[PDB]
Amino acid sequence: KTHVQLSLPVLQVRDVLVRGFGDSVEEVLSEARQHLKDGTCGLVEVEKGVLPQLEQPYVFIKRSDAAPHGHVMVELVAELEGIQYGRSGETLGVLVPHVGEIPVAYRKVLLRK
User: Region (Disordered) spans which residues?
Assistant: First the structure.
């Protein structure tokens, strides 16, 4: 399937134990896709002061379209020193590894895979 329905646990930035997916744009997109498949991906909602508390490169989910079965259609865009790899809509948040942090909410998305 080109799209996969996921419910991503929303984590508080200060709870996140592993604050990024790796060291290159290509690695973080690779790792983010692997974690999304394995159900070990969390989402941090971007506000003032969030991104400086996480590790670059960043992986964003961005709205790819205007929402089947309550699930917003999204795609992955990486960012490193202010350059984005990918072009998409509004950020729904930043993806991080989930290693058992308690979420505050769930974000229903349809992921272009």
Answer: 1-113
Q: Give the domain extent around 35.
A: 3-112
Query: Which resolution, in Å, applies to this structure?
Result: 1.8
CATH number of the domain enclosing 29: 2.30.30
Q: Is 41 exposed, middle or buried (0-12, 13-18, 19+ CB in 10 A)?
A: buried
Rounded Cα distance between 5 and 108, Å, is 7
Q: How was this structure determined?
A: X-ray
In contact, 59 and 75? CB cutoff 8 Å: no
Q: Which residues contact 107 (CB under 8 A, 6 or more apart)?
A: 7, 8, 10, 43, 72, 92, 93
Q: Which residue has the tokens 């744009």?
A: 25
Picking from 85, 108, 111, the residue whose alpha carbon sits closest to that of residue 2 is: 111
Closest to 78 in 3D by CA, of 95, 99, 65, 53: 95
Q: What are the structure tokens assigned to 27, written together?
A: 């690695």
Number of domains in the chain: 1
